[PDB]
Structure formats: C-alpha cells, structure tokens
Design a protein around this nucleic acid. Structure first.
Lengths: 55, 55, 55, 55, 55, 55
RNA sequence: GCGUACAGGGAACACGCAACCCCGAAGGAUCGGGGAAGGGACGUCGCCAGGGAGGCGAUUCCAUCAGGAUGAUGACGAGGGACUGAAGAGUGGGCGGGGUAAUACCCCGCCCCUUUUU
C-alpha cells in the first residue's frame, strides 16, 4: 500500500500474475494497465460498477 | 486490456477485491495505492523474484 | 514584494491561508489560479466594479 | 478556479484589497510582487514554511 | 498469396489491369478502392455471393 | 465503386475470382492480396510493373 | 496529440479539429449518424526486401534509496516584505581598453533580448 515512485515503464510483476503497469502519463490522467487472466474479471465502467454494486 | 483514464482521487473498485487506486501525480511520477488483503503479497518486480530463486 | 519567481506548478500556498497557485503556462501566457474560500471576491478587469463601488 | 489567462504585464491588480499582482514573467518563472502591509503576513510553501511548521 | 505491406496510396496494379488501391486508415475500417472496368461483376463481400446464389 | 468500409478480414471472396481480403493494420500500412488464382501474373507494388514495362 | 488573437464569473480544463467505438435498412462514388465514452486493445511513431509467407528501429523529475504507512529525501543570495535578489552561458546592439605601423575582425568592465539555477 502506497508505493510511491513507480516510473513510466516499470512495475512488471506485481500482485500475483496480474501485472498492474503504468503505460503513459499525460498531465493528470494516468493510463493504467491490467493484464489479468481471462477467468478474473476487471471492471472500471461506472455503470458496470453500479451494476456490480446492485447485482 | 487497456482501461481508458483513471484520474486524481477516483477508482473505487477495479479488478477483484484489490482496489488498485491512484493517489495523484507530482510531475512525471505516480502514487499507486493497493489495498489488497493481508495474506496476498504485493512486492515489486523481478529483482526480488531473482533474489528468492537465487536463494 | 517580489517574493519568488514562481515555477510552473510550483506552489501550493503563497502569502497567507488563501491557497493561490499557478497552473498551465503556454508561452508568455501564465494561467494563475486562486483557490480561496468563496466569501471573498476576485476580478480580472475591475474598472466597472470600482465604478459600481462608487455607486 | 482557473479564472485568468494573463500574458506579460497585462494586469497590475487582481482581486480585492489584498494586492496580489503580477509584475513581469521570466518565461516559466512568474513574479508575484505584492504590496500588502506589514500587519498582514506574506510567506511561501518552502523550507522556511517547514521552519515555521517546526518552530 | 499474402502479398502484403503497401503503404497509403502505394499499389496501382494487382495481377492484370484492375487497379485496386488502399486509401486512408481511420480506425480499423480500411478504405479499399477499386477502379476496375465495370463489365466484370465485382461487388462487396459474400452476401452478394448469396444474392447470386439464390438468383 | 469505392467501398469505403471493409472490416478486418471478414470476407473470403469479393466479387469475381480475385478475393481481396485484409489481415492486419499497424501504422498506416496494411496487408492485402490473399487467395488469387495462380495463373495470372500478380506482382507489386509498381516498380516490378515498370520493370516489365522495360521488358 | 494540434491550433484560440478571441472569451466571463467560482467549472484544478472554455471552441474547433484530429483520435477512438458502433450502425447502416449502404455502393458503382473519399457517402451519413452518435458519444466522451466502452470492453480483454502487450499502448505510440517510423523504415526495408520479397512472393502462394513473415520480419526490423527509437521513447520523459529516468533523481536516488525504501516499503506493506494518505513515506523520506535530491535539486538558487538560498531564502525575500526594497516594487527584493545572486550566479553562468549565448544571439545581438551601443560605448571605452587590449590582441598595438595602421584598417577590419575577436576577447575584457557597463546597460537591454533569449536561456539555465527546488
């Protein structure tokens, strides 16, 4: 928790085989990248997050 | 795989129950917050993997 | 009175507890930023607010 | 918040009677030059602000 | 077969004089042009082959 | 005659026995030219056609 | 990612464009509509030779060291209430001195332009 200074092009083996990686910083948006396996779902979509909060 | 944009002080629940969360940007560095639970580990990249597999 | 040659995105507080910053510089254009509490006022071209003050 | 887009020397007074001006821009450096009285304080957010935080 | 790597506007003759070029690429829908003689029954994809199959 | 939309490889035959089908897009270059019959002299891009014009 | 000379009070991002995704009930021709979002996209830009098929080149505090905690530090006289500064280069413009038979050019003390120093 709170790992400061993971620079743009690093962080290649974190979590466990899920690889959260910073790929591109432009101002105040940070294009994060998850490479989780296909049996583990990733959702960011607000309305998909509201329907994962509903059902 | 590429989630679009996650901005400063957002990103409530992504992936599984890990809350990979951004905590601002000071220049060209980031501050990733990961509140994964207390039996899964989050270590950094393959330097530590080659520490343990050369021990 | 010429306190500091302020860099792009340098400060977070200048003077007293008013939180006046900068952000965004395109050439000679410098976008100043005031994050004051809303009970006090700020104006770009104050000639009509001074003439309405005298009214 | 992002109220004003001044170039070099375009205004000399911003706001009410607190006298936060802009007097010359050295490119990326921008010069806040004030004429607030001695009974109110003017400071910065620097190592002297950490000195005033400590003492 | 797989006679690939043309750039924008690159090819002008494929086989005999049928003049199949490649226009600009916006997204993934490529803009295949053809400037053939119209006496051959060139069309779109296999829905028109289904149209001549029923006809 | 200029079909503006074709998707990535969704055809197998187009028109008569020429069967233009794309496979891949990176940059602004494209793959083309699959599955022509072998009896017609197919060559590219144009400099071999100028070489046969010298013949 | 690129232009704005424009513009008014409380929106850490105002107008084009590009860029992306989807539909056509679509054609003999660079045809329309919608949005700032959605889905598995190992992201952006650039070049080379060929045939029943695929390969190559460059990327941002690149400032370090450390964790499982809304961290430490490395960066300007080194801080300033006089409308404050200090240091270093360069393009130029004027003055005076030197590189001295002499002319032109190039360095040095002074003032303005650009740029560097949390």
């Amino acid at each position: 928790m709170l790992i400061l200074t993971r620079r743009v092009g690093e962080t290649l083996m974190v979590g466990d085989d899920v690889t959260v990686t910073v790929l591109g910083v432009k101002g105040n948006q940070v294009r994060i990248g998850v490479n989780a396996p296909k049996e583990v779902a990733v959702h960011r979509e607000e309305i998909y997050q509201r329907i994962q909060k509903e059902k």
